[PDB]
Each structure stands twice: as C-alpha cells, then as structure tokens.
C-alpha cells in the first residue's frame, strides 16, 4: 500500500496535479493516454524492481553502497536552481521517465 501510494504517479486526481505541476503540464498528463501509459509502465517496472530487491535483500535491509548519492544530488540541484518546493513544477513527468 505504501509502495503504491509513494511511487505510482496519480494522473486521475486533478486537484493534486494542479498543486505539483503547472497548468500546461496537467492538461497534457490528463489528456493523452500515451503519457499515462508511460507512467503506468514506469510503476510496473518499479514494481518488478521491488520484487528483484526482495530476492537480493531477503532480510529487508535497504542500506546499500552505490556510486552516486542521488538524494544529495537532488538536494544540490534544489539549491543550485533555487527550487521552490511550494510552487508547482514545470518538469513534465514524461521528461523524468
């Protein structure tokens, strides 16, 4: 339940999309199903990755050693480009995928 809530993009809730994305972006997400299909595929790939992880780490220990610190890189990007967490974003969800 938590995994689906946190990682599955919700293109159905119009009010939620307005808060996070800009007006020109929510329309594209809501209008065409090609983008929505890509978002659905993204979660399916993530769900497949979830099961692969469960095999690699049966004990459930999520602490791993990996090359690049993504969370700090995101933090650097937020400071470098003065991202405002309160305002809606202009980053199209498909550009992320």
């Amino acid at each position: 339940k938590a995994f689906e809530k946190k990682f599955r993009f919700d293109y159905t809730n119009e009010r939620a999309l307005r808060r996070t994305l800009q007006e020109d972006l929510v329309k594209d997400v809501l209008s065409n199903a090609h983008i929505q299909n890509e978002l659905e595929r993204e979660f399916e790939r993530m769900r497949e990755d979830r099961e692969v992880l469960r095999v690699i780490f049966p004990t459930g220990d999520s602490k791993v050693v990996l090359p690049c610190n993504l969370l700090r890189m995101i933090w650097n990007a937020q400071k470098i480009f003065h991202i405002n967490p309160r305002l809606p974003s202009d980053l199209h969800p498909i550009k992320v995928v």
Binding site: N13, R15, R19, N84, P85, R86
Partner: protein, 148 residues
Amino acid sequence: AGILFEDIFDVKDIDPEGKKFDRVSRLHCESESFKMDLILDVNIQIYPVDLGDKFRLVIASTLYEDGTLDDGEYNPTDDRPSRADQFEYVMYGKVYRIEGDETSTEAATRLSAYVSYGGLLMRLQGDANNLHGFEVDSRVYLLMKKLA
C-alpha cells in the same frame, strides 16, 4: 517598506525544556493580534528577557526601509537611514524551512517558518496569509523592541 511580518508578542516560557545554553535562551512567545506562535533563540546575555515581557517583533528583508537590498555583507560605515535604529535587538538570519498543513489537494492553512540567525533558531507559526512573505533561502532581519 520591505517588511515581511510585524506583530507584538508576549513571552510565555523562557526555557521550558531547560537552560541548554548559558548565553542563549529559547523564548516561547504568542501574539495577540495575529495569534502567531513564536519560538525564538535570543542572546539573553546582551538582551535579557523575562517572563511576561511584551515586545514588538518585525521580520524584514532589508534594514534600509527604502527597498534597497542589503546584499548580506557587513557595512558598519554605512550612514544610510536604517530601520534598526528604532529597535533594540536586531538579528540577521536565513529562512531554511517553511512547513505547512498542506495536503495533496488542499493548500496550507497554517504555516511554520524556520529562520536561523547564525545558529539562533526561530520558528514562526500561524495562518498562511500572515507568512506569505517568507521564502526559503531568503535573508531576513529580526528586529525586537521590548514594550513597557
């Protein structure tokens, strides 16, 4: 004016948890006009504060009261008129967090603004409309004047 927030606060607690630091006390204050909750770290050595003290708190983005940005460097020799002349305790800090009761759909009704004045921390809670001038990573001035 370049004033982000202004109100009068009354000190309710000086150090509820305890005296964590000798020269700094954590004021827990509440306003009566906007009903904003204030937690403030104050240099109690140079600016003593007592329970029940009333003071005027102003959060401004500039001290020149002319709209000119200070640029964030020490300029003691500046003779330009300063809003700090009317206040007794002036602190310069950076807002590092803006929390709120926002949900996925609904906006925020209550906002919490956290400011670090060189390590002295301030949290300003209350209605979102009263804290709209606060933007994270922005430099603000805290101006305090005890009221008799």
